[PDB]
Amino acid sequence: AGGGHVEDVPFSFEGPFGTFDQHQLQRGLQVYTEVCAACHGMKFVPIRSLSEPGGPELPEDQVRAYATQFTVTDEETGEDREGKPTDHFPHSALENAPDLSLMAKARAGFHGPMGTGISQLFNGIGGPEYIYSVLTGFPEEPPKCAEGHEPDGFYYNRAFQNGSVPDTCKDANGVKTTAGSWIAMPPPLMDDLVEYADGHDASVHAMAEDVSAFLMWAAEPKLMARKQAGFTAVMFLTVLSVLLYLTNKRLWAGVK
Amino acid sequence: AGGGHVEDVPFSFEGPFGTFDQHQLQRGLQVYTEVCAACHGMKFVPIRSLSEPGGPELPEDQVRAYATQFTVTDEETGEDREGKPTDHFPHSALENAPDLSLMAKARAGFHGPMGTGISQLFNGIGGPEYIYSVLTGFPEEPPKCAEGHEPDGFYYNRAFQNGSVPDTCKDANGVKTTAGSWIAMPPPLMDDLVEYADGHDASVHAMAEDVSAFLMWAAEPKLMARKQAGFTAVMFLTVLSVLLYLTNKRLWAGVK
Amino acid sequence: GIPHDHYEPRTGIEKWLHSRLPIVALAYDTIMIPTPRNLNWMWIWGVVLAFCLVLQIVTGIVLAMHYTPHVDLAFASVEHIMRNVNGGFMLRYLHANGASLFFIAVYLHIFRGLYYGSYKAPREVTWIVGMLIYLAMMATAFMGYVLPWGQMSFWGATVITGLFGAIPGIGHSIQTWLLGGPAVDNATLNRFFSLHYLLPFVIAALVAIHIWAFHSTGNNNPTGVEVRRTSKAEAQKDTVPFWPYFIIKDVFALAVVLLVFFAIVGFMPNYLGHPDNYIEANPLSTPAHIVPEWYFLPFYAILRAFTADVWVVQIANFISFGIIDAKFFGVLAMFGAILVMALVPWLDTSPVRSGRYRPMFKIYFWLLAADFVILTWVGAQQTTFPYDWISLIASAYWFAYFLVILPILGAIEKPVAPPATIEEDFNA
Amino acid sequence: GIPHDHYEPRTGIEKWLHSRLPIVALAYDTIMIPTPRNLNWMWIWGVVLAFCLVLQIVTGIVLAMHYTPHVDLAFASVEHIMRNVNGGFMLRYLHANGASLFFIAVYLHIFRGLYYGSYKAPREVTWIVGMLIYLAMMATAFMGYVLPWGQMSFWGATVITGLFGAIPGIGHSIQTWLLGGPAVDNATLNRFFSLHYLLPFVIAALVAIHIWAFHSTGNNNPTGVEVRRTSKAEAQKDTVPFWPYFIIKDVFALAVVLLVFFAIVGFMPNYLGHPDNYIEANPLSTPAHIVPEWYFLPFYAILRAFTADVWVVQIANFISFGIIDAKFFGVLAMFGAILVMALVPWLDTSPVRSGRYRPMFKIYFWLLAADFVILTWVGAQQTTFPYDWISLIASAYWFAYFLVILPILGAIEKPVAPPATIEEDFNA
Amino acid sequence: GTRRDFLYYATAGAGAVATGAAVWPLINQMNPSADVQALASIFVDVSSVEPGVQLTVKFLGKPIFIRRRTEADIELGRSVQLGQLVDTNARNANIDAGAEATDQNRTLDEAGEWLVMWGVCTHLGCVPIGGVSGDFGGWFCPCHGSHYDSAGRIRKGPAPENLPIPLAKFIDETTIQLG
Amino acid sequence: GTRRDFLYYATAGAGAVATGAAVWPLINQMNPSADVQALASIFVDVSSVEPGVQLTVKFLGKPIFIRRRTEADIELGRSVQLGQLVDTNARNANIDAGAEATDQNRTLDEAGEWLVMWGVCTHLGCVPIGGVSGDFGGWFCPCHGSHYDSAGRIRKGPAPENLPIPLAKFIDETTIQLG
Ligand code: HEM
Ligand code: HEM
Ligand code: HEM
Ligand code: HEM
Ligand code: HEM
Ligand SMILES: C/C=C(C)/C=C/C=C/[C@H](OC)[C@@H](C)[C@@H](OC)[C@@H](C)CCc1oc2c(O)c(OC)cc(OC)c2c(=O)c1C
Ligand SMILES: C/C=C(C)/C=C/C=C/[C@H](OC)[C@@H](C)[C@@H](OC)[C@@H](C)CCc1oc2c(O)c(OC)cc(OC)c2c(=O)c1C
Ligand SMILES: CCCCCCCCO[C@@H]1[C@@H](O)[C@H](O)[C@@H](CO)O[C@H]1O
Ligand code: FES
Numbered sequence A, B: 001a002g003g004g005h006v007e008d009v010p011f012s013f014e015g016p017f018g019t020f021d022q023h024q025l026q027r028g029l030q031v032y033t034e035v036c037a038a039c040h041g042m043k044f045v046p047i048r049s050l051s052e053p054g055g056p057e058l059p060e061d062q063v064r065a066y067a068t069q070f071t072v073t074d075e076e077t078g079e080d081r082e083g084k085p086t087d088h089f090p091h092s093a094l095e096n097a098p099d100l101s102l103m104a105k106a107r108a109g110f111h112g113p114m115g116t117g118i119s120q121l122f123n124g125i126g127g128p129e130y131i132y133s134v135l136t137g138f139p140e141e142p143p144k145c146a147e148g149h150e151p152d153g154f155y156y157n158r159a160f161q162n163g164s165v166p167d168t169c170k171d172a173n174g175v176k177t178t179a180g181s182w183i184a185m186p187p188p189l190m191d192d193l194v195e196y197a198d199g200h201d202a203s204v205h206a207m208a209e210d211v212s213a214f215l216m217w218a219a220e221p222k223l224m225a226r227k228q229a230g231f232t233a234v235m236f237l238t239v240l241s242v243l244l245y246l247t248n249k250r251l252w253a254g255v256k
Numbered sequence C, D: 001g002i003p004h005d006h007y008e009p010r011t012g013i014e015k016w017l018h019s020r021l022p023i024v025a026l027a028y029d030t031i032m033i034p035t036p037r038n039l040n041w042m043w044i045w046g047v048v049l050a051f052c053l054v055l056q057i058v059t060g061i062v063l064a065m066h067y068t069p070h071v072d073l074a075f076a077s078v079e080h081i082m083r084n085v086n087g088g089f090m091l092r093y094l095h096a097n098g099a100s101l102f103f104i105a106v107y108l109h110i111f112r113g114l115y116y117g118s119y120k121a122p123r124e125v126t127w128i129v130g131m132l133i134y135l136a137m138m139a140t141a142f143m144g145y146v147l148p149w150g151q152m153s154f155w156g157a158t159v160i161t162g163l164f165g166a167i168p169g170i171g172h173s174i175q176t177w178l179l180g181g182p183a184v185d186n187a188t189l190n191r192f193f194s195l196h197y198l199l200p201f202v203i204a205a206l207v208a209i210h211i212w213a214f215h216s217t218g219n220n221n222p223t224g225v226e227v228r229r230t231s232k233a234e235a236q237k238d239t240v241p242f243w244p245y246f247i248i249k250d251v252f253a254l255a256v257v258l259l260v261f262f263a264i265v266g267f268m269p270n271y272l273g274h275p276d277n278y279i280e281a282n283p284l285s286t287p288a289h290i291v292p293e294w295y296f297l298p299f300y301a302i303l304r305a306f307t308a309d310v311w312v313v314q315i316a317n318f319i320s321f322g323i324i325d326a327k328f329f330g331v332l333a334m335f336g337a338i339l340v341m342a343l344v345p346w347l348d349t350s351p352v353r354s355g356r357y358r359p360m361f362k363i364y365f366w367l368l369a370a371d372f373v374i375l376t377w378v379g380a381q382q383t384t385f386p387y388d389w390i391s392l393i394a395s396a397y398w399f400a401y402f403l404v405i406l407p408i409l410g411a412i413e414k415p416v417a418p419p420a421t422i423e424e425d426f427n428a
Numbered sequence E, F: 001g002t003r004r005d006f007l008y009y010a011t012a013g014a015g016a017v018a019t020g021a022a023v024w025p026l027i028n029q030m031n032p033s034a035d036v037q038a039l040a041s042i043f044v045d046v047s048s049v050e051p052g053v054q055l056t057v058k059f060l061g062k063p064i065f066i067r068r069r070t071e072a073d074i075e076l077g078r079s080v081q082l083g084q085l086v087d088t089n090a091r092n093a094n095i096d097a098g099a100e101a102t103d104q105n106r107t108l109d110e111a112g113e114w115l116v117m118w119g120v121c122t123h124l125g126c127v128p129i130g131g132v133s134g135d136f137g138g139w140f141c142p143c144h145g146s147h148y149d150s151a152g153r154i155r156k157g158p159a160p161e162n163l164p165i166p167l168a169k170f171i172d173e174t175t176i177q178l179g
């Protein structure tokens, strides 16, 4: 296959100063809960982290109420019970629906240029944009070359680079005509499919962009922590470098 | 509690030259299977070891047929299925029935004397004899002192040193009168309860003594390998010591 | 071996201690060694490596405290470290990127050696020991990368154990022993963990000898001209005591390196990595975009440049009655590329130490460096045309450099005159 | 240093190598050191320890290859090793009993030192470093024993982390940090594994220094009389080169030790162990017959000898406003017993080196040895009468020996005359 | 002049600062992780428990005993002089911090029938044996020989305090809420 | 005389003997343990598999493909010439060891419809991508670029052989027994 091109979304968290947008992640968690969760799971995500700083930061009792809707098989009782915040979100209900816990990091959207990766040295890995583009990329009409050869069960998606493509859609050398390919995930986002609280718009674009940020957090919950840690460290060091530079220059001057 | 005294059985495997008695272990496996297994399990024992040298050494197809009876929740299929020789014996069916996999290694029968352990330096740990004595020690009549105070649900056993004992059976200082105590295991061995194949006698004594040896193997399957390895090593070394002793004597003589 | 003054016990405790265990005197002579005045910023990679080794070891021990080496829990166990362990996310990213920093540094450390002839007599042992560290380093990094048990982890594990199952005859045996089974599985993960833990200590011990090695001959400087050893008088003209002069530039250099390093870990922790290792290992499918770790790319390039349709492979296949096929040829090429490099002290016939004073040498050297970059770059490209030709020409140039060019330049080349003394170079 | 002869490069390779890295010369001086002729069989425990350390390390690495450090799999994982891993049963039993052999040897190694004054100037550093190894050894053995995760493993883990939660003020903190939680759990097992792997390497490094220590002063002999160092001539009258004389004696000694050791592992592998650790750890119940590992018994005895009703505890308790209660007093007594031993170079005021020539000394020494045995023996007895008194008198005698008796004998004591020279003793 | 001798301190200080920023987390990683800290508050059915019966329950990784005492247990308990106890503090998280080790001050009910406490020896952690063991008709810790009376009060050994009582209260006719 | 120079040999020899008895097991512990050597022989339901569909299955820790080929796959397969291959051996454990890499010699049935082989590249182990991938209508190994034809025969790259076929046979109308 190969690495394609994705829609470049200007998420809040990008940049050394970027940070999550608490309400967005909140909206995202709702999209994930009412839409994705039907097939996808997040096995490495402890529900109780919905409360931790740097994320959606819901109030503990809400989070506790939330975990309720999940049936979990205890780890001693062998039985089933209501979800406790100490539980992880469940495994994907749909066998072939990948786990979304790390999806925003499992994908790159800025491939290249020329294998030099200089594109990421500036654009990051593009995991969230990638996810965005996949939710976006569901055209109403199948690309021409596939007209009557669409694998039943699949759907054409402009961002997907790892799906099958009808032979009638490849060129003389076997390569594909289409920008995307056929994914087994039926389109998930319909306009205003999620009833936001604060009224905020639920346009496929918006939902898609929100749920993406959520997933970016679900994969890098300590994003903000990392950057703060990063900024702090850069500071000690910039200062320390200067001192040492002067100490060294001073010390050596007695030689040159 | 404390460490009591057990009936000293002269098992085949004791002594630096002792080895298991293949047929005995075979009988033992039968006792365990038709009697104990009802409550006890052996979670660390892979059924397929019933075939390995140094043990019962049943023929692989027998072992395969054997594993059939058990029901195992297939680790992938998540479905129940029959038992494969690659499976371990199941967990104890009876909640409070301890696992018998290592029991013969997790018990001492020769305690002392005077905490000096000199008694084991000659008598071993006594795990098998201990187990024997417990199957033996179920008297028909409860010791005098307990006449009408037997904890319902228990049974007096002369080898057991970790059970409860009626107040009416302790002395001025709280110590117990009885040699044994009350165990939650109802007597398990009735005369000729196991119809041995080769006719061999199924007297409670015999069964008890057989199943014990089985359990000794179930805990130390590599008992013989170890002793052979041991004997071999002692040999190299005895010889090597002598040579080196002479080499050293020779070498040093040139000094004094 | 330079002319200086050793440790003199002054304190009260110091005189007591010294007569019993002169450990203080040892530490003294290690950091009070007269070092050439003209060393440049290319001589600071040794200490960046020191730091790296220490950093990896402590972050490793810490990480091993929360990691479960068992296929059913290893991947989950590393997420646990990212999400639960205080500063786990940072400790992880630091061990990871720490690896990259470790290699960026050796390559620079190595190429510095190639250019200045730091591997030439009497520095052959320093060089050989160095090579041993390099192999150890690679083995270590390899096993470490497997632990997460992600996709890149598993298949990387498969492909590398596989290299040994290409050895004629004993091959499948060695490979089954490395795997403890018929495939990469728990037994493999479990032993890699043990060895990943053990190897760093071996590297450490080797580093001790490495150090001892150059203290025995004295460090080489950018002019290839030795320090004068006829009198402390002129010896001091060429040198300066290691402390505080070089101890300080080292710390200064380290601060600048760490500045960039932390910027990397803080803001772009996943750049030098592979997104697929964030996917749990699947023994039934290999990611379409699988790709070795960048520090492994150049040698991986050399290995897959050799397919069946390559002539030199075909000649060899025929000349050895089919024993040396493409598979095994690629393997031999890869380890050969490394081995050849280890032999340079002997393949290099020029008596001139520093490549600074070697006109022809310089061209080939830079071609070598460019070739290393190119090889790393092709490693990430597909096997289709023209990458197959590029990887091939590149591999060819690599062996051509150590086997043909350097031996020949030894005679052909007419070298420039080097400074008479380090003093003279430092001043000028 | 004794007057001996330097290494001398003869071979061709040897001259080449020597001028670059004199590693061959180093190895030479390490095993070509002139050693006193009169050393007896009490001087062979050093090498039995060497062997033990090496044995533990290699069997450890091997074992770590099949062991899963996680409460859900650790115990199962060790049975797997006993039942499935080729020679696993033997490798396990060898690591286990190897521990016991390690301690039986230190104690003999230590008591040898106490009797011959091998800790007396100028050998204080050898001694101190030794003490460090001892602490390391104990910490290592402690963590190792936890790994199986059996009953004795868990509660042993509880009781020992607990020791730190007895330190006034900072106590509960230190203890929560050691456990990574509110109880002994997976986080504890997981970090013990990492540290158990790491510590042996520290011991190893310390052993390196230990060795270096006595090579710097020369080994002490049974007469406490130093080797003559006024001329190679008479120096050789007191000594013999380490190789082949002592290298051989050592291998001979090792064979005899290993003979008994293997007899133990082969025929009675579980004698020196506790049957309860063959029972999976139960955090809800402590085995009625729980008991420390024999090599830990003596110090465990000293700790529980100090209950509330011991007047010195009552005094101490009051005189300190309830800070130093029984709990903390027992802890201080235990570590104090060890610390006191480490201070003997200073508590011992006699100028006579070997206790062989100290009449009063011997009586107290043998009482000490008997006391050590007695303490080990009470450790396994109940706390009822008369063991409480026996443990108490015993603990008392222990501190009395280092704190009172030794300092005093320094003056009181009238010592016998020692041989004029080692030569003289060897001949006589 | 002193711009360089100042430089030394600005440097040395910057160093030490970093050296510590580095060390603290190496140390702090070992402190309870986010998943541990998820401390809850279980509930226990007691309807079954006849008097003279102890119930062991896991909570926070250690045991918690719930013994329904007999008349005898309650008597011996009450016939004790606060002056004879080794620890006079009630060690009860339910009542006042300064309360006294009086039998009544150690049970949940007034009839002095429900004794609820951590089965964690206060010496070094082991689990004391119940069923009226030890010299004082209570519990016996096999680890170092500590005895506790029918109220779980330390009466002998190295244990310095009485078995702690956690926040425990009857949620109804037959159910205690620990935690 | 030579009783001591013999002694040296008897000793040195005894040593080397032990040294090896010690080493071998350190080495041998790493060989497949008793639980791994437990090699079985699974069965696979194929009733579902439409033609042009590949089925991946685990077995011995590696995958095993079971593709029901299309006319086209069988077509291209047969149109190749033994002399046009890289490896002429059928690598089929079912048929003779010396058989030839002919498309009939690679399938389980005669209609040449059931291709069953280890999805283990013969180069270094990866799992070649199917769905008619590559430049020979077969599989493509992404690890180093090996191509295999519709019969799983190596046609280019570093792979030296054809995907192996294991003991596989139809146990009935719709069920293949691997192993
Ligand atoms: C079958 C002949 C059989 C054997 C053998 C056996 C052994 C056995 C041992 C060694 C113990 C452990 C005692 C100890 O802790 O020292 C033990 C304990 C219990 N058993 Fe058992 N047992 C055999 C058979 C049976 C059967 C068929 C039952 C169930 C009817 C049973 C039950 C129990 C129970 C319960 C215990 C634990 C209670 C206790 O007092 O500790 N056993 N058994
Ligand atoms: C663990 C990684 C390594 C560490 C920590 C290390 C450290 C050092 C240090 C501190 C120096 C002196 C300072 C300097 O010149 O940078 C040095 C010198 C040197 N190193 Fe390494 N090194 C490592 C790996 C290697 C490798 C892989 C090679 C290449 C085989 C190598 C070859 C050399 C050479 C030739 C010198 C010059 C010595 C001299 O001038 O006499 N080193 N190394
Ligand atoms: C020689 C220096 C070392 C190098 C080059 C090295 C390299 C690596 C690499 C590349 C990884 C994968 C990192 C990732 O997940 O992205 C890793 C993981 C790991 N290493 Fe090391 N390592 C070194 C030393 C150590 C040491 C001494 C230990 C001893 C505990 C250790 C323990 C671990 C552990 C537990 C992991 C798994 C957790 C993780 O994924 O980071 N490492 N190592
Ligand atoms: C890894 C454990 C240890 C090893 C491998 C070790 C090894 C050695 C060796 C090889 C010797 C020389 C031969 C001999 O006299 O036995 C020695 C000497 C000595 N060791 Fe240790 N030792 C260890 C632990 C200890 C400990 C715990 C102490 C107690 C403080 C200790 C005290 C001494 C003393 C006093 C000497 C005599 C030094 C002299 O004669 O100058 N050692 N040790
Ligand atoms: C300093 C020498 C060492 C000592 C004194 C020591 C001691 C111990 C002890 C007492 C045990 C418990 C044995 C038992 O289960 O009965 C143990 C277990 C273990 N040790 Fe060590 N050990 C040493 C070095 C090592 C090293 C270097 C490693 C890892 C490289 C290691 C790995 C293990 C493992 C995996 C176990 C658990 C399996 C088992 O129960 O045997 N040990 N060790
Ligand atoms: C128990 C100890 C063991 C098993 C030690 C083994 C040591 C092996 C060598 O170390 C000396 C080896 C690491 C070194 O060869 C010189 C490297 C340059 C190997 C380069 C390397 O990487 C790959 C890789 O990372 C992959 O990941 C997804 C995948 C790979 O194929 C697709 C490769 C690969 O094709 C090669 C050649
Ligand atoms: C993370 C690293 C850590 C926490 C290192 C800690 C090191 C601590 C010390 O080593 C220096 C320590 C091992 C050493 O104290 C000097 C021992 C003599 C302690 C002796 C010891 O053993 C026991 C034991 O084994 C038990 O179960 C078998 C049970 C025990 O009571 C019931 C004890 C016990 O009561 C004592 C005092
Ligand atoms: C010399 C190296 C300097 C590195 C400076 C790095 C600034 C990185 O800034 C990164 C972006 O590049 C990245 O796309 C987003 C993704 O969320 O995260 C930011 O922190
Ligand atoms: S821990 Fe209970 S008596 Fe010591």
Ligand code: FES
Binding pocket: C159, F121, F122, F123, F124, F125, F126, F141, F142, F143, F144, F145, F146, F157, F158, F159
């Ligand atoms: S493993 Fe398939 S091409 Fe290399």
Ligand SMILES: [Sr+2]
Binding pocket: A008, A009, A010, A011, A014, A129
């Ligand atoms: Sr963007």
Ligand SMILES: [Sr+2]
Binding pocket: B008, B009, B010, B011, B014, B129
């Ligand atoms: Sr017997």
